Amino acid sequence: LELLVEALNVPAPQFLIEVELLLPPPDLASPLHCGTQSQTKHILASRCLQTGRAGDAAEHYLDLLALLLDSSEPRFSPPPSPPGPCMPEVFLEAAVALIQAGRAQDALTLCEELLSRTSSLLPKMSRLWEDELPYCPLWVSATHLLQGQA
Amino acid sequence: EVGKAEAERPARFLSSLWERLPQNNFLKVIAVALLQPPLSGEGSQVLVHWLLGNSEVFAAFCRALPAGLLTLVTSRHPALSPVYLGLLTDWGQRLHYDLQKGIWVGTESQDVPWEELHNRFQSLCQAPPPLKDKVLTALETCKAQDGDFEVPGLSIWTDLLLALR
């Protein structure tokens, strides 16, 4: 996978009927489904965290978030596909990895940046006074949980 | 009449009264007698002493009456302020929080519920300033005593100070 990432870094239609025109676009079950650089750097980092090489997993996840959030100028690098994780779960896995690496002072600047950018989404905690009904997505609770363990 | 007589002490009279007749009625009465202006304040002055002598009644006193009445009582008689706060403080310290229902509760049934204790403190805080600073300081010192948390579920005293603003 390490090799594959460096591989995917690199990116004629004849007036005739060829095979490509007839071949179907591939599915997810296919072995020929290969996402983009970013969906695979996320595969690598996921498998790195699954294995217990968390120091390395931390570097990969900071390279992933660097791709996704330092994306203004170049060709776009997409977040993981929908069957994978949503974008707050990518920040959380990033924090978990840096925690196991012994870099807890960085997993706080991660979680704080996640709650900074989505403040406006978060509930105003006036229900805090009034105390099942109101709404909060799990990734917000989970961030306080990790910000604790940090 | 007993004071001018001076034969037996008022404490004896009050004790005898307390056994004979219905207690909750008597207590309601006492509250109001504690506030009537003099008609000659020796009347009230005797009862404060009798009450501070006998804790059990004052246990049922501050337990039975409503809030605003005890608030007016205490502002009238500063001698009643600190003990009453001790009574309330003691009822706070014998609650426990359960996480599933977002409410402080007591283990035993006769332990004052959250609502009543909130009521009394709200009445005490909505009072003249001679008592407001006293109760507020008595609460902060009991908060800091039990860990200076700033989030609910840990300290009854945090939840009170929050449910005031």
Side-chain angles (χ1 to χ4, degrees), chain A residues 72-114:
Chain A
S72 37
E73 260 294 351
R75 75 170 57 254
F76 297 153
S77 297
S81 79
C86 64
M87 195 77 198
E89 297 185 40
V90 172
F91 274 89
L92 296 174
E93 291 172 56
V96 167
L98 284 72
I99 278 153
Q100 293 183 6
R103 300 188 56 186
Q105 198 65 57
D106 316 345
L108 296 165
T109 70
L110 216 57
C111 287
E112 276 168 74
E113 189 65 277
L114 170 73

Coordinates of all heavy atoms in Angstrom, one line a residue, chain A residues 72-114:
Chain A
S72 N -6.8 23.7 -1.5 CA -7.4 24.9 -2.1 C -6.9 25.0 -3.6 O -7.8 25.0 -4.5 CB -7.1 26.1 -1.3 OG -5.7 26.0 -0.8
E73 N -5.6 25.0 -3.7 CA -5.0 25.3 -5.1 C -5.1 24.0 -6.0 O -5.7 24.1 -7.1 CB -3.6 25.8 -5.0 CG -3.5 27.3 -5.1 CD -3.9 27.8 -6.5 OE1 -4.1 27.0 -7.4 OE2 -4.1 29.1 -6.7
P74 N -4.5 22.9 -5.7 CA -4.2 21.9 -6.7 C -5.5 21.1 -7.0 O -6.6 21.4 -6.6 CB -3.2 21.0 -6.0 CG -3.5 21.1 -4.6 CD -4.0 22.5 -4.3
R75 N -5.4 20.0 -7.8 CA -6.5 19.1 -8.2 C -7.0 18.5 -6.9 O -6.2 18.2 -5.9 CB -6.1 18.0 -9.1 CG -5.2 16.9 -8.5 CD -5.1 15.8 -9.5 NE -4.5 16.2 -10.7 CZ -5.1 16.3 -11.9 NH1 -6.4 16.0 -12.0 NH2 -4.5 16.7 -13.0
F76 N -8.3 18.4 -6.8 CA -9.0 18.0 -5.5 C -8.7 16.5 -5.2 O -8.6 15.7 -6.1 CB -10.5 18.3 -5.6 CG -10.7 19.8 -5.8 CD1 -11.9 20.2 -6.4 CD2 -9.9 20.7 -5.3 CE1 -12.1 21.5 -6.5 CE2 -10.1 22.0 -5.5 CZ -11.2 22.5 -6.1
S77 N -8.5 16.3 -3.8 CA -8.3 15.0 -3.2 C -9.5 14.8 -2.3 O -9.8 15.5 -1.4 CB -7.1 15.1 -2.4 OG -6.0 15.4 -3.1
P78 N -10.3 13.8 -2.6 CA -11.6 13.7 -2.0 C -11.5 13.0 -0.6 O -10.6 12.2 -0.4 CB -12.3 12.7 -2.9 CG -11.3 11.9 -3.5 CD -10.1 12.8 -3.6
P79 N -12.5 13.2 0.2 CA -12.5 12.4 1.4 C -12.9 11.0 1.1 O -13.5 10.8 0.1 CB -13.7 13.1 2.2 CG -14.6 13.6 1.0 CD -13.6 14.1 0.0
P80 N -12.7 10.1 2.1 CA -13.1 8.7 1.9 C -14.6 8.6 1.5 O -15.5 9.4 1.8 CB -13.0 8.2 3.3 CG -11.8 8.8 3.8 CD -11.9 10.2 3.3
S81 N -14.9 7.6 0.7 CA -16.2 7.3 0.1 C -17.2 7.2 1.3 O -16.9 6.9 2.4 CB -16.2 6.0 -0.7 OG -16.2 4.9 0.2
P82 N -18.5 7.3 1.0 CA -19.6 7.2 2.0 C -19.6 5.9 2.8 O -19.7 6.0 4.0 CB -20.9 7.4 1.2 CG -20.4 8.2 0.1 CD -19.1 7.7 -0.3
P83 N -19.4 4.7 2.2 CA -19.4 3.5 3.0 C -18.3 3.4 4.0 O -18.5 2.8 5.1 CB -19.1 2.4 2.0 CG -19.8 2.9 0.8 CD -19.5 4.4 0.7
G84 N -17.2 4.2 3.8 CA -16.2 4.4 4.8 C -16.7 5.4 5.9 O -17.9 5.6 6.2
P85 N -15.7 6.1 6.4 CA -16.0 7.1 7.5 C -16.4 8.4 6.9 O -15.8 8.9 5.8 CB -14.7 7.1 8.3 CG -13.6 6.7 7.3 CD -14.2 5.9 6.3
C86 N -17.2 9.1 7.6 CA -17.5 10.6 7.4 C -16.3 11.4 7.9 O -15.3 10.8 8.5 CB -18.7 11.1 8.1 SG -18.5 10.9 9.8
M87 N -16.3 12.7 7.6 CA -15.1 13.5 7.9 C -14.8 13.7 9.4 O -13.6 13.7 9.7 CB -15.2 14.8 7.1 CG -13.9 15.5 7.0 SD -13.0 14.6 5.8 CE -11.4 15.3 6.3
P88 N -15.7 13.9 10.2 CA -15.4 13.9 11.7 C -14.9 12.6 12.2 O -14.0 12.6 13.1 CB -16.8 14.1 12.3 CG -17.5 14.8 11.3 CD -17.1 14.3 10.0
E89 N -15.3 11.4 11.7 CA -14.6 10.2 12.1 C -13.2 10.1 11.6 O -12.4 9.5 12.4 CB -15.4 9.0 11.6 CG -16.8 9.0 12.1 CD -17.5 7.7 11.6 OE1 -16.8 6.6 11.6 OE2 -18.7 7.8 11.3
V90 N -12.8 10.7 10.5 CA -11.4 10.8 10.1 C -10.7 11.7 11.1 O -9.6 11.3 11.6 CB -11.3 11.4 8.8 CG1 -9.8 11.7 8.4 CG2 -11.8 10.3 7.9
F91 N -11.2 12.8 11.6 CA -10.4 13.5 12.6 C -10.3 12.7 13.9 O -9.3 12.7 14.4 CB -11.2 14.7 13.0 CG -10.9 15.9 12.1 CD1 -11.6 16.1 10.9 CD2 -10.0 16.8 12.5 CE1 -11.4 17.2 10.1 CE2 -9.7 17.9 11.8 CZ -10.4 18.1 10.6
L92 N -11.4 12.0 14.3 CA -11.3 11.2 15.5 C -10.2 10.1 15.4 O -9.5 9.8 16.4 CB -12.6 10.6 16.0 CG -13.6 11.7 16.3 CD1 -14.9 11.0 16.6 CD2 -13.1 12.6 17.4
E93 N -10.3 9.3 14.4 CA -9.3 8.3 14.2 C -8.0 8.9 14.3 O -7.1 8.4 14.9 CB -9.4 7.4 13.0 CG -10.6 6.5 12.9 CD -10.7 5.9 11.5 OE1 -9.7 5.2 11.1 OE2 -11.8 6.0 10.9
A94 N -7.8 10.1 13.7 CA -6.5 10.8 13.7 C -6.1 11.0 15.2 O -5.0 10.7 15.6 CB -6.4 12.1 13.0
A95 N -7.1 11.4 16.0 CA -6.7 11.7 17.4 C -6.3 10.5 18.1 O -5.4 10.5 18.9 CB -7.8 12.5 18.1
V96 N -7.1 9.4 17.9 CA -6.8 8.2 18.6 C -5.4 7.7 18.3 O -4.7 7.3 19.2 CB -7.9 7.1 18.2 CG1 -7.4 5.7 18.7 CG2 -9.1 7.3 18.9
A97 N -5.0 7.7 17.0 CA -3.7 7.4 16.6 C -2.7 8.2 17.3 O -1.8 7.6 17.9 CB -3.5 7.5 15.1
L98 N -2.8 9.5 17.3 CA -1.7 10.3 18.0 C -1.7 10.0 19.5 O -0.6 10.2 20.1 CB -1.9 11.8 17.7 CG -1.4 12.2 16.3 CD1 -2.3 11.8 15.2 CD2 -1.3 13.8 16.3
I99 N -2.9 9.7 20.1 CA -2.9 9.3 21.5 C -2.0 8.1 21.7 O -1.1 8.1 22.6 CB -4.3 9.1 22.1 CG1 -4.8 10.4 22.4 CG2 -4.3 8.2 23.3 CD1 -6.3 10.4 22.4
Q100 N -2.2 7.0 21.0 CA -1.5 5.8 21.2 C 0.0 6.0 20.9 O 0.8 5.4 21.6 CB -2.0 4.6 20.4 CG -3.3 4.2 20.8 CD -3.8 3.0 20.1 OE1 -3.0 2.4 19.3 NE2 -5.0 2.6 20.3
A101 N 0.4 7.0 20.1 CA 1.8 7.3 19.8 C 2.5 8.0 20.9 O 3.7 8.2 20.8 CB 1.9 8.2 18.5
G102 N 1.7 8.4 22.0 CA 2.3 9.2 23.0 C 2.4 10.7 22.7 O 3.3 11.3 23.1
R103 N 1.5 11.2 21.9 CA 1.6 12.6 21.4 C 0.3 13.4 21.8 O -0.2 14.1 21.0 CB 1.8 12.6 19.9 CG 3.1 11.9 19.5 CD 3.4 12.1 18.0 NE 3.5 13.5 17.5 CZ 3.7 13.9 16.3 NH1 3.8 13.0 15.3 NH2 3.7 15.1 16.0
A104 N -0.2 13.1 23.0 CA -1.5 13.6 23.5 C -1.6 15.1 23.3 O -2.7 15.6 23.0 CB -1.7 13.2 24.9
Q105 N -0.5 15.9 23.5 CA -0.6 17.4 23.3 C -1.0 17.8 21.9 O -1.3 18.9 21.6 CB 0.7 18.0 23.7 CG 0.5 19.5 24.0 CD -0.4 19.7 25.2 OE1 -0.1 19.2 26.2 NE2 -1.5 20.5 24.9
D106 N -0.9 16.9 20.9 CA -1.3 17.1 19.5 C -2.8 16.7 19.4 O -3.6 17.3 18.7 CB -0.4 16.5 18.5 CG 1.0 16.7 18.9 OD1 1.3 17.6 19.7 OD2 1.8 16.0 18.3
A107 N -3.2 15.6 20.0 CA -4.6 15.1 19.9 C -5.5 16.1 20.6 O -6.7 16.1 20.3 CB -4.7 13.8 20.5
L108 N -5.0 17.0 21.4 CA -5.9 18.1 21.8 C -6.0 19.2 20.8 O -7.1 19.7 20.7 CB -5.4 18.6 23.2 CG -5.5 17.5 24.2 CD1 -4.7 17.9 25.5 CD2 -7.0 17.3 24.6
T109 N -5.0 19.5 20.1 CA -5.1 20.6 19.1 C -6.0 20.1 17.9 O -6.7 20.9 17.3 CB -3.8 21.1 18.6 OG1 -3.3 20.1 17.7 CG2 -2.9 21.4 19.7
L110 N -5.9 18.8 17.7 CA -6.9 18.2 16.7 C -8.3 18.3 17.2 O -9.1 18.9 16.5 CB -6.5 16.7 16.6 CG -6.7 16.2 15.2 CD1 -5.9 17.0 14.2 CD2 -6.3 14.7 15.2
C111 N -8.7 17.7 18.3 CA -10.1 17.8 18.8 C -10.5 19.2 18.9 O -11.6 19.5 18.4 CB -10.2 17.1 20.1 SG -10.1 15.4 19.6
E112 N -9.8 20.1 19.4 CA -10.2 21.5 19.5 C -10.4 22.1 18.1 O -11.3 22.9 17.9 CB -9.2 22.4 20.3 CG -9.4 22.3 21.8 CD -8.3 22.9 22.7 OE1 -8.2 24.2 22.7 OE2 -7.5 22.2 23.4
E113 N -9.6 21.8 17.1 CA -9.9 22.3 15.8 C -11.2 21.8 15.2 O -11.9 22.5 14.5 CB -8.7 22.0 14.8 CG -8.8 22.7 13.5 CD -8.6 24.2 13.6 OE1 -9.6 24.9 14.0 OE2 -7.5 24.6 13.5
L114 N -11.5 20.5 15.5 CA -12.7 19.9 15.0 C -13.9 20.7 15.7 O -14.8 21.0 15.0 CB -12.8 18.5 15.4 CG -14.2 17.8 15.2 CD1 -14.3 17.7 13.7 CD2 -14.3 16.5 15.8

